[PDB]
């Protein structure tokens, strides 16, 4: 899993908005530096900037 290091406000209809400290699971990372993620915290799914999160156990 990953943890958000910053808040992120969606900038596209495909993005996932999140707050710092949310825990996310990566659904797919095969397209580039924007990863498809699912928030374990909020249940929402969408693309995130991969440099805004850090790995977690």
């Amino acid at each position: 899993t990953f943890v958000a290091l910053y808040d992120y406000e969606s900038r596209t209809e495909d993005d996932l908005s999140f707050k710092k400290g949310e825990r996310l699971q990566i659904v797919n990372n095969t397209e580039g530096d924007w990863w498809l993620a699912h928030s374990l915290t909020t249940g929402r799914t969408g693309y995130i900037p991969s440099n805004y999160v850090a790995p977690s156990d």
Binding site: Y6, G32, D33, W34
Partner: peptide, 10 residues
């Protein structure tokens, strides 16, 4: 906050 990455390429 860091700059955002470029959007994904197909």
């Amino acid at each position: 906050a860091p700059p955002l990455p470029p959007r994904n390429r197909p």
